[PDB]
RNA sequence: GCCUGGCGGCCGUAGCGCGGUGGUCCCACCUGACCCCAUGCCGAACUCAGAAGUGAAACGCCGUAGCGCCGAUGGUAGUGUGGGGUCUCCCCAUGCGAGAGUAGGGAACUGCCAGGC
RNA sequence: GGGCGUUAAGUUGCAGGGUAUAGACCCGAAACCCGGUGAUCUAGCCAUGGGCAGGUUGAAGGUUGGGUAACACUAACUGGAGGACCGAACCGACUAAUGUUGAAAAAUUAGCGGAUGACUUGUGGCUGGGGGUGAAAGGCCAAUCAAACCGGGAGAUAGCUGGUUCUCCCCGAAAGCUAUUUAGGUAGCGCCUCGUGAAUUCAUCUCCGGGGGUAGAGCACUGUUUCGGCAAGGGGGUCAUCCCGACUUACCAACCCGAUGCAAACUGCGAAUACCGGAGAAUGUUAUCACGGGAGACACACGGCGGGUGCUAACGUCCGUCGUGAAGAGGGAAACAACCCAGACCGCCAGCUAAGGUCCCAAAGUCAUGGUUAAGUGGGAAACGAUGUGGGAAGGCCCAGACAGCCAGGAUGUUGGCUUAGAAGCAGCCAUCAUUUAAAGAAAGCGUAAUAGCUCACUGGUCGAGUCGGCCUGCGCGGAAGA
RNA sequence: ACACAGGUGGUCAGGUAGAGAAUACCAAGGCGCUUGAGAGAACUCGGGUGAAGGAACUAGGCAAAAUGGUGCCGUAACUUC
RNA sequence: GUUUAUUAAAAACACAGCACUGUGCAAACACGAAAGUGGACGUAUACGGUGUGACGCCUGCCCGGUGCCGGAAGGUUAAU
RNA sequence: AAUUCCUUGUCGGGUAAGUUCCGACCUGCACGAAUGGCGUAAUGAUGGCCAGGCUGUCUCCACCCGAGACUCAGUGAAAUUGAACUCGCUGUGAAGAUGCAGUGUACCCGCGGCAAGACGGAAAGACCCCGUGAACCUUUACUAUAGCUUGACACUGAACA
RNA sequence: UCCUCCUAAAGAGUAACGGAGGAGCACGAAGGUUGGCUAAUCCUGGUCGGACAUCAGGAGGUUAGUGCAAUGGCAUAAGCCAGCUUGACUGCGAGCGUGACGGCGCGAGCAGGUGCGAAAGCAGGUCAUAGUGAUCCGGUGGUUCUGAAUGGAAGGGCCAUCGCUCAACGGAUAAAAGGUACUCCGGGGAUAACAGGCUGAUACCGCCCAAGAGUUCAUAUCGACGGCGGUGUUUGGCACCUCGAUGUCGGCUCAUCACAUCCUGGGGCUGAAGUAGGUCCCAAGGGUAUGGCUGUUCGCCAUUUAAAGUGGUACGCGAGCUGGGUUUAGAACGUCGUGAGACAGUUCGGUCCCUAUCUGCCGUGGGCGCUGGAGAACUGAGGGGGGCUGCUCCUAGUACGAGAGGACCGGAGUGGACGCAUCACUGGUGUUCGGGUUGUCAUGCCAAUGGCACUGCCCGGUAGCUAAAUGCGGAAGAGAUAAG
RNA sequence: CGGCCGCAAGGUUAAAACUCAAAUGAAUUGACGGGGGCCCGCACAAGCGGUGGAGCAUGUGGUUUAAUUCGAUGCAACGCG
RNA sequence: CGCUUACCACUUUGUGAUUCAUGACUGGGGUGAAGUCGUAACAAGGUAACCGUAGGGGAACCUGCGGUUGGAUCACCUCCU
């Protein structure tokens, strides 16, 4: 639907503590989501085992009770934390004078509020069009009351089937424009895969995900705030990590547990950076009672886009209060197996984050020095033109050795097709 | 020919303001009242009897434009009729022609009948 | 006081115009009711007679074929029931094809289903129409069936359609208002005609007496704004100093004070016109009003102006007013109801002319003067873009030489430091003192793998005559893709 | 409505092959169906035969193509035996 | 097995079975303005109606409304 | 699910690919016990699906045989029809032009074919709406009435508490 | 139905399913008269007065009030208090206003009796406009009327009064709900569905500016906030047309046009090392899949290809075909309703007619003309057909490149789809050739033949025709050009 | 799970992986009993006087600032060290 | 020798049976330890227990019927067979 819910709207929240559907939902998570939406909740109903109802997703008497509660509260709309089937919302809508909305609609609504860009607006519109396509079946019958079953001649098919085809034609046109936005990113991606720069995408929960991590690393202005979500479109800036060289970091939007399946598809269409990320990072926050519950959900979103496989260093947030680990630049092993604990909110650790980046960077334990061309002065001018080696030292017999080791590069250019007729060194 | 009281005309060039001025001519206060009347208590109001006292206030007169108020000519908006271009809008001939400003005017004038030179 | 009256001409024929009641101009329903005719088609039932080639399976009756304490267990085979099977006659009708003005108002050809049964068939009979009969379909009851056929009431009724037949002359509408079991019908009124009366009646214009609240303006009022001024009260920086102060704060002040807009439901103003009344010429076949006879119309259309609604869309809708079409031809706008000119009594192988035009189609200027455009503009299109072209008033510079191009000089400190033998702008800064001002930048863009180089402030530039921009304006240009 | 491809109750029932009143061919008997002559286009109808592939056709194996008899063996799930 | 003769042959209808109800015979019920007749020359192991549909397993809870059946303490109640 | 809107629900199968099918899950918009619930051998011109075989259904048609169609002789209709000297395009127009305007093109007549158009023929559209139209059906619409039922009076008498 | 404002264009009047609000009463005082009186707002000093009371003073005719909506009014007050009261009287009413009428409204004054005031005088309801209901039919009271032979009386009339959410408010009647997919009649494109027409809000496409996004870097690539256009092209609006008839999706067959171009050609920019792309310009000559599911356009998928364009053509095409779809009558399920029945639910089943006059095409003739009549061979004004491409190899592993990879030049072969011809080959067919064979009948019979059974069934097959067979081709050039 | 039986409900035959240092039996000594018995104590009863709402003093639940120093916390801390 | 017939390996077709992995969903293990609900059993465990079998709890468990002991206990001052 082109229309989206207005912020500041009065509303009621109906959440069964056990609302079925695997019960991975959290009421504390719901309050953060509703605050961003602009829902004004006078009363939050908490219930025990209301039978999932084919009619209302809540007990038939409870549906009358929530209708009575809504009439008294003055709340303009009804919000339900677990999913309502298209009939299920429609039956609830008949019982109360006020209209109703659902969590799939509410997360879709949240995306609209946090979107300030054209790519985000088209992406949100497509996702709503998919969710509303299922929702519109009840609405189409109400529209056809005026039609009175006319349209038998012209379209051979029964009336209202043609109306679905027109919405589907709008869906087909919508898909073509969305493809163009991705195609433009892919032309940029073709230049981006120069093979000299790795692609990095930062993923996480809406609050746990550290898009703030880019701010400590690049000191670049970005919108990081308490409001749920709020970074819908990705930001890519140049960061030269000393250990890995030039790298590009992309801020993928944060996601929540039980993410609407259409919304993961829409998020991926904008975020193909997640699909192509050579290095990926997941951030976990202690604000939720169980850090583990957020971890499994992030994996499911990654599984949806098939990026779950990449081995990932895990960053941590809320560490500032905990102060459990002070960042330490010590390698117990060359692999250095650990999960980074530094949090970007206070800038706790930077060289230690880089040590984890050295673990990410491919390295040789032997680090055998590459053969070096004879003219150091010409090499130094080339280093000034490109990258000067961080450590360079003289070696015995007039040899020069540098910390960067590239034996394959020296074989490919310095010693490949040379005749060596003189054969001074055999 | 002056100053006062009434009853009108005209109702801001008429009003308000500021400063002055006048007293048994008048007028206003003022003096008394379990008297005629009179307060939903109220001789601040209304009456009645009248002398002292004063123009303080009021009242009237004079100056003062500080504001009110009136306000040209010219220009403009509009519009009647014919004609034209015809973005919803105009333009031309022609007749009528604002409001708002502006220079300015502006502190009234006049009748009738009684009390005082 | 009023209201209705006051001896005011009628009556009967004949002819015509209306209205009422009858079939009431004419044709045309679906239906309803009444009395009959059909069960030779069909549906059920009754009575009495027929048919079912062939082939197969085989029940019961089992005369009976073992054994257990006894039960369980369990032992041979003649017959000929079946709403049995396969399949002709027979009955039906599942798919396809042809036919569909056929051979046929449901058939033909290939395949199909039942065919000893709740079968089929012949001959009679019975049940009759709001009735029958129904293994149930609103099936069937003579190619007719949510109620047969025939005659009657019957020319039912039909605010609905269609048609309405000879000639000429005169006038000539309306598609509005109010009502409606009413919206496509009707009644009254307005508009048309015919007659009879009547006064400078009516119109146009001039002059005069009005009243308003429209346009337009304006913001005092009702609201709606913007800015500047700003402590009343509270935010409150001091504040468990409210401190009868540390201040009223380093915030809005609230009315308020100056300016600025906006209004259909705002008005301290206020037109043009329109309306009403009066007088007066001139004119118009009393054009006006009243009464009586006869209507039609009460579906309007477009354009102009003033608006509502829509999207300042619609050949949209709904109003007010005018014009045209309707109901008006002719000339023009290529063709064209409503747009422009003009209102056709007739004839002429006569002139003038409106709108519109004068190169050919195609009547008339290859007319005159001056100017503009170079696109075929003319001959579809906006925001915007541009040394297209033409005009106008200004500004700077210039014979201490206009504007170009052009080459050289344009350098220490100021390579001094700071991501480091790049330390200097390319990550940033300290910087403007000048030495040696014809001239010299601790520079605008750069570049070199730092360290060279580039253009320009000044000079000499011969050539030199005008030169650089802006504004306003006429006509062009690009923006500019359809089957 | 017709000199109409439909409908119309019973009876008789030869030969050969065949279970048979199926069917093929014949008896006895009756007929060639009241417009013909050419030519041998498309197209239409009713058929015949098809290389290779074989349901790819199509809404759907619609239609067509196949199998088909008698004798002897042999025969599953389930079962109301 | 029957059926929409003449666009529907079906999952429709029927069916044997099962229950519920009425019905004592001059039966109930029907066609009859009535006589009569069918039911039936039958007699509750019979008839009529309604529903379901062989078979196997079964048919839970509820009489609040409406109907039907039984009862009236009182009230209301026509003609007269 | 002859029932589930969403829905092509989710899984597993069968295919290269399966909205059908089959089997599970229960989240029954809107199953449920003679308005019958669940199964069921046999049966079905029943509904849906999957195989083997087979083929002109198909790729993609080809040839052949007969009946027409063609020509010749004889007999000899039909629907329809305001009149026609009956092109195309673009525009206009009661808004889809053989007939108007402009332009291109076009000697005059058949015969055999194809159907793009003559808003082609057939049939006062069947869809929609109106008529202070009609029929039939239903009920808790109004007004009645058959039918059932209740009392009184008559037909209809006597005697004893 | 009534009242008030606006639209309503300064007389009045004026419509819409146009924008805003009220009434279906109240008071015997809130009426009449006489007399008196004058507000809302803040400030100052003061009680449990402080923003809220009540004082003493300071602003105005009034920002107050009006029984209640709105507008017009209002100081002489209509506003507020007191006293006395009942004119909230009866009969009439010159004259107006407003309506088509029925009616509604104002009305000085006359007459008879009241009230208040000394008097002038004023009063026939409320400051005004809403607060209502005709007629019929009945009820009650009075009456100076009539009363069916007469005297009465019932009954009627007149006068006063009563009974209507007759609210659909100019009111059919005392009294009235639904269904029809079983439907039928008379009309209407006066009125919706399909298509065409207007429009273009939406849609789609393009441009204007450019905060941004881009590894630094608005325009390589997209572009927020806003703006302007184009098209008829999607959703809509309208109702001009079509209801005495314009067949509805899809598929099959057959097409044609536009260029907003999918492939193939030519370019520009690139954040284009090569390969491969992105974006834009020019360019319409040709080309632009097969299947599974399902009725599908769609969609999802599997696998092709150089690509499997986007639209118009009545969302092309039913006198061309289909009928899965919808769109009838049978049945069932879920839900709604007491029910008949219903469903923008599902499911199974369910009649698609035309002999071509005209234009139009596709083929093929006749007549006359072209100037004496013939028989030939041609020029070419015009017109049509044809215009596709892949794969491999050389150049060359060269250019390009750190590698991985790997050339828009220039040559050669080889195919796919398409069109044309042909029948030498390979095949098909071949009822008009030969043979085998089942059943029967005939020619006397054996033998040999023939008829009939689909050509009886087959097996083969010549000519001819034909594809699945083989040949051939879409070119190279040349001229004028588009972007460049 | 398979077999067999059963109309079902279920019966019978009857494992495995996985897990633990136990699981159990009878006795002993205590503790405890909303088990029984006998007793005792202002424990109850029979009485007398108080506490539970006004100034001293103590702690905590606890607040506050510079601290409101530390401890004592049912009975057996709370006029306590 | 060629040829033919029997036997037969590879192989192929149909139809079954038994093993292993796996098959959304679903049924049922001991368990780090605190924020985590009731009290069924052990005392007569506050309704004696558990044994079979049905139905209900939808927390252990409750209740019906039969069984078993692997069950605790013998009374308030208080006129009279
Ligand atoms: N974890 C954590 N975050 C903190 C802390 N303090 C402040 N923050 C902020 O909380 C974070 C909020 O979540 P974000 O990291 O913004 O989530 P995000 O995914 O970047 O946000 P979106 O992309 O807008 O959804 C950042 O804004 C941090 O700066 C802290 O102590 N811990």
Q: Is the dihedral of CA A321, A325, A326, A327 positive or negative?
A: negative
For residue A36 and ligand 1, the question of a CB distance below 6 A is answered with: no
How many Cβ atoms sit within 10 Å of the Cβ of residue A326?
A: 11
Are the C-beta atoms of residues A371 and A413 closer than 8 Å to each other? no
Tokens 């490919």 sit on residue:
A412
Non-local (6+) Cβ contacts of A328 within 8 A are A352
**Is the minimum distance from the CB of A384 to strand C below 7 Å?**
yes
Choose among A310, A346, A342: nearest CA to A200. Answer: A310
CA A67 – ligand 1 centroid, Å:
38
Tokens of A296: 């499994």
Instruction: Tell me the C-alpha distance between A401 and A403, whole Å.
Output: 7
Instruction: Tell me the C-alpha distance between A181 and A176, whole Å.
Output: 9
| Number of Cα atoms under 13 Å in the Cβ half of residue A36 | 22
DSSP-derived pairing of the beta strands A392-394 and A400-402:
antiparallel
Instruction: Tell me the C-alpha distance between A175 and A169, whole Å.
Output: 10
Tokens of A261: 């399946």
DSSP-derived pairing of the beta strands A245-251 and A236-241:
antiparallel
- Closest atom of ligand 1 relative to the A317 alpha carbon: 1
Instruction: Tell me the C-alpha distance between A351 and A243, whole Å.
Output: 10
**Which bases on strand F have an atom closer than 7 Å to a protein beta carbon?**
5-7, 27-30, 127
CA A345 – ligand 1 centroid, Å:
7
CA A203 – ligand 1 centroid, Å:
12
Q: Binding site annotation covers A229?
A: yes
Choose among A185, A209, A210, A212: nearest CA to A199. Answer: A185
Are the C-beta atoms of residues A34 and A13 closer than 8 Å to each other? yes
Are the C-beta atoms of residues A346 and A320 closer than 8 Å to each other? yes
CB neighbour burial string for A203-239, b if at least 16 within 10 angstroms, e if fewer: bbbbbbbbbbbbbbbeeeeeebeeebbbbbbbbbeeb
Residues in chain A: 426
Instruction: Tell me the C-alpha distance between A131 and A397, whole Å.
Output: 73
**Which bases on strand C have an atom closer than 7 Å to a protein beta carbon?**
422, 449-450
Q: CA A167 → C1' G354, Å?
A: 43
**Is the minimum distance from the CB of A238 to strand C below 7 Å?**
no
Instruction: Tell me the C-alpha distance between A109 and A290, whole Å.
Output: 27
| Burial zone of A390 (CB within 10 Å; 0-12 exposed, 13-18 middle, 19+ buried) | exposed
Instruction: Tell me the C-alpha distance between A21 and A119, whole Å.
Output: 32
What does the H/E/C string look like for A269-321?
Answer: HHCHHHHCCCEEEEEEECCCCCHHHHHHHHHHHHHHCCCCCCCCCEEEECHHH
For residue A179 and ligand 1, the question of a CB distance below 6 A is answered with: no
What's the Rg (C-alpha) of chain A?
28
| Burial zone of A381 (CB within 10 Å; 0-12 exposed, 13-18 middle, 19+ buried) | exposed
Choose among A250, A279, A261: nearest CA to A185. Answer: A250
| Burial zone of A254 (CB within 10 Å; 0-12 exposed, 13-18 middle, 19+ buried) | buried
Tokens 């030039």 sit on residue:
A246
Backbone angles phi, psi at A417, to 5 degrees: -105, 15
Are the C-beta atoms of residues A250 and A273 closer than 8 Å to each other? yes
Please report the resolution in angstroms: 3.2
CA A318 – ligand 1 centroid, Å:
9
Tokens of A172: 């087909």
Q: Binding site annotation covers A252?
A: yes
Q: Binding site annotation covers A233?
A: yes
Q: Binding site annotation covers A416?
A: no
Instruction: Tell me the C-alpha distance between A162 and A157, whole Å.
Output: 7
Tokens of A229: 């979500």
Tokens of A141: 């019958």
- Closest atom of ligand 1 relative to the A215 alpha carbon: 29
For residue A206 and ligand 1, the question of a CB distance below 6 A is answered with: yes
What does the H/E/C string look like for chain A?
Answer: CCCCCCCCCEEEEEEECCCCHHHCCCHHHHHHHHHHHCCEEEEEEEECCCCCCCCCCCCHHHHHHHHHHHHHHCCCEEEECCCCCHHHHHHHHHHCCCEEEEHHHHHHHHHHHCCCCHHHHHHHHHHHHHHHHHHHHHHHHHHHHHHCCCCCCCCCCCCCHHHHHHHHHHHHHHHHHHHHHHHHHHHHHHHHCCCCCCEEEEEEECCCCCCHHHHHHHCCCCCCCCCCCCCCCCCEEEEEECCCEEEEEEECCCECCCCCHHHHHHHHHHCHHHHCCCEEEEEEECCCCCHHHHHHHHHHHHHHCCCCCCCCCEEEECHHHHCCCCCCCCCCCCCCCCCCCCCCCCCCCCHHHHHHHHHHCCCCCCCCCCCCCCCHHHHHHHHHHCCCCCCEEECHHHCEEECCCCHHHHHHCCCCCCCCCCCCCC
What does the H/E/C string look like for A205-230?
Answer: ECCCCCCHHHHHHHCCCCCCCCCCCC
**Which bases on strand G have an atom closer than 7 Å to a protein beta carbon?**
192-195, 203-205, 213-216, 220-225, 234-236, 247-250, 271-272, 276-279, 295-299, 315, 324-327, 343-346, 402-403
Instruction: Tell me the C-alpha distance between A278 and A280, whole Å.
Output: 7
């Amino acid at each position: 639907m082109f229309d989206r819910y207005d912020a500041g709207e009065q509303a009621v929240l109906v959440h069964i503590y056990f609302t079925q559907d695997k019960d991975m939902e959290d009421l504390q998570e719901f309050e953060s989501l509703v605050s961003s939406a602009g829902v004004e909740a006078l009363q939050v109903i908490t219930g025990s085992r209301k039978a999932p109802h084919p009619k209302y997703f809540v007990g038939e008497g409870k549906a009358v009770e929530i209708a009575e509660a809504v009439k008294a509260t003055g709340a303009s709309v009804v919000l339900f934390d677990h999913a309502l089937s298209p009939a299920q919302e429609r039956n609830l809508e008949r019982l109360c004078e006020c209209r109703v909305i659902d969590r799939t609609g509410l997360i879709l609504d949240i995306f609209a509020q946090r979107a300030r860009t054209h790519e985000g607006k088209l992406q949100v519109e497509l996702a709503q069009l998919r969710h509303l396509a299922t929702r519109l079946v009840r609405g189409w019958t109400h529209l056809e009351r005026q039609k009175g079953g006319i349209g038998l001649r012209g379209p051979g098919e029964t009336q209202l089937e043609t109306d679905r085809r027109l919405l589907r034609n709008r869906i087909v046109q919508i898909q073509s424009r969305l493809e163009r936005v991705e195609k433009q990113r892919e032309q940029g991606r073709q230049s981006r895969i120069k093979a000299d720069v790795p692609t990095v995408s930062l993923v996480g929960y809406t609050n746990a995900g550290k898009s703030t991590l880019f701010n400590r690393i690049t000191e670049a202005r970005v919108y990081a705030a308490d409001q749920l979500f709020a970074t819908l479109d990705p930001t890519l800036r140049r960061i030269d990590v000393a250990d890995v060289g030039e790298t590009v970091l992309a801020d993928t939007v944060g996601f929540i547990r039980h993410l609407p399946h259409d919304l993961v598809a829409a998020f991926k269409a904008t975020l193909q950076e997640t699909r192509q990320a050579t290095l990926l990072l997941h951030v976990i926050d202690a604000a939720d009672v169980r850090v583990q519950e957020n971890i499994e959900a992030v994996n499911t979103v990654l599984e949806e886009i098939d990026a779950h496989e990449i081995p990932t260093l895990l960053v941590m947030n809320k560490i500032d209060m905990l102060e459990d680990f002070e960042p330490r630049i010590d390698r117990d092993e060359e692999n250095k197996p650990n999960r980074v604990w530094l949090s970007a909110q206070t800038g706790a650790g930077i060289p230690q984050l880089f040590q984890a980046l050295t673990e990410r960077l491919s390295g040789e334990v032997a680090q055998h020095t590459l053969r070096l061309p004879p003219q150091e002065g010409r090499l130094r001018s080339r280093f000034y033109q490109l990258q000067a080696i961080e450590k360079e030292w003289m070696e015995e017999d007039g040899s020069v050795s540098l910390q960067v080791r590239m034996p394959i590069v020296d074989w490919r250019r310095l010693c490949k097709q040379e005749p060596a007729l003189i054969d001074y060194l055999i």
